[PDB]
């Protein structure tokens, strides 16, 4: 029981390139995507763990 649940929702994510069509096919257990995102790549960064305030 993790967080009052014996079930598991394994998530997945893919990037779809322009000119490419993705196809979802299922007959159950599919957690449907509702909100997708269109982004432009910023190469060369990371993520800093911090409690510091913003200014």
């Amino acid at each position: 029981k993790v967080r009052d649940q014996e079930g598991r929702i394994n998530y997945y994510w893919t990037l779809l390139e322009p000119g490419d069509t993705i196809i979802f096919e299922a007959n159950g257990n599919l957690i449907a995507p509702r909100y997708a995102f269109a982004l432009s790549r910023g190469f060369g960064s990371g993520i800093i763990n911090s409690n510091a305030p913003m200014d």
């Binding site: 060369g44 960064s45 990371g46 993520i47 800093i48 763990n49």
Partner: peptide, 8 residues
């Protein structure tokens, strides 16, 4: 160069 270090 504009780079970073923190990798998990």
């Amino acid at each position: 160069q504009f780079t970073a270090v923190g990798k998990e």
